[model samples]
Target: PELLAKAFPFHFAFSRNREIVQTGEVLERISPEPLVGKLIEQHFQINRPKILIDFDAISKQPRALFILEFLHNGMQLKGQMMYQPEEEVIFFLGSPWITDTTSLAPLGIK
Candidate 1:
């Protein structure tokens, strides 16, 4: 939860990227909009997916959105997604790609 609230600097970092950023400046380059859109495209490119989503927090931060995009593609969406509320962490169900209303209400994500 601290991670969600601490203004985590995440992005769709590739192989050439570093394990962790120390300067906290270079990571500001990428944006989430395009990447999130790309993710939607990527998902469709594969087999007829059971579901597709985008949850980069684009309105929040560019880097954070990028990292979220990367996670959606590379890792599997499972269990609860933990994020910060004020200072404490809370886990919730759902992925970033829930662009529709049914997904949220079905799980009571809101």
Candidate 2:
């Protein structure tokens, strides 16, 4: 888990109950508070595919691209939601969507 977190700085994983279990270093660092154990809906809003934030609903659309808006900073993230059946968790593997290079500084990205 620590290796995964380091490899994917913007990734996050949640369980069937919609509770975040793991978060990448950068994601956790940028958040105002800890993300683990918190509900995913409290920090993110799905802006694409128009599906509910339920775990089952999200798990069903694993192939679909996901666009999530961070409620804290309004940063849009584009990524894929991969369902790990064995672990019974969903991993959001994505990075912030930035059009201009200048935007990275404001988001604390180098």
Q: Which candidate achieves the best lDDT against the true structure?
A: 2
Colliding pairs, model 1: 1-84, 1-89, 10-63, 11-66, 11-67, 12-66, 53-97, 54-96, 54-97, 55-96
**Residue pairs that clash (backbone atoms under 3 angstroms), model 2:** none
- Which regions of candidate 2 are displaced past 4 Å? 1-3, 99-110
The top-ranked prediction according to TM-score is 2
lDDT (Cα, tens digit) per residue for candidate 1, span 17-49: 111112111122222223321323442221212
Candidates' RMSD to native: 15.3, 3.6
Each candidate structure's TM-score, on Cα atoms with residue i matched to residue i, is 0.18, 0.85
The local distance difference test score of model 2 is 0.85
> How high is the CA lDDT of each candidate model?
0.26, 0.85
Among all windows of 10 consecutive residues in model 2, the one with the lowest summed lDDT is 101-110
Model 1 misplaced stretches (Cα beyond 4 Å) = 1-6, 11-33, 40-80, 83-110
Total clashes for model 2: 0
Candidate 1 whole-model C-alpha lDDT, 0 to 1: 0.26
Indicate the TM-score of model 2. 0.85
